[PDB]
Amino acid sequence: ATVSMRDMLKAGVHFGHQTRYWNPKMKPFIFGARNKVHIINLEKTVPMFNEALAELNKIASRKGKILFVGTKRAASEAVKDAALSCDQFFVNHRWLGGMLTNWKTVRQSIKRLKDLETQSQDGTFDKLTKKEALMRTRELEKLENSLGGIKDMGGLPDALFVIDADHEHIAIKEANNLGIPVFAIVDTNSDPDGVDFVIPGNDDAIRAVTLYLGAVAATVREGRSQDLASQAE
């Protein structure tokens, strides 16, 4: 969990957006302006990232629920695989508005969802109608899209790992309203005050995004190693 100060350099973490769209609060993590862009200070970046990795690792050791948030279509696919690989669930694209707080109301939704899945190999064969069948399939698809990947939780998650943060400002607001700690790959245009572990990376190119995903994925496996067994053979 000590990603080479050079691997990210090729990944694309250094390239932010332009001044026209630059959060003035991000000044502590600036190195200059290549073609009027804003090159994040990697030297400033790296201690925070590695520190959060350790933080997130001790979490998984205490068996605290983790979570990830879907972003752009490419980001969403990448997030899904890394999450499914281990555990810690994952969002997909919309965050289903006020999931936190309205977690009891969406709990009933999760209940109905799972029942339909179970009844998708039951109710389908018997009493099938050229009308009702389309109803069942379509609704499941919509529900699955976002609710799927969270249905497992069966309770309130104890952590959150979003990306970019700006695209999900809504998610951070609810998390701040409950104490649940969070981590965000803040970029040059993202309000980080609400975050408890500022990862000043770049939600772009996917390449670099895949790096962050791969990194954390590894740290949560160390948590599982403490939850399963130590390295040996």
Binding site: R6, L9, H14, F31, L42, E43
Partner: peptide, 9 residues
Amino acid sequence: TESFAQLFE
């Protein structure tokens, strides 16, 4: 693009 290390030097 030039390496960050050389640029920072």
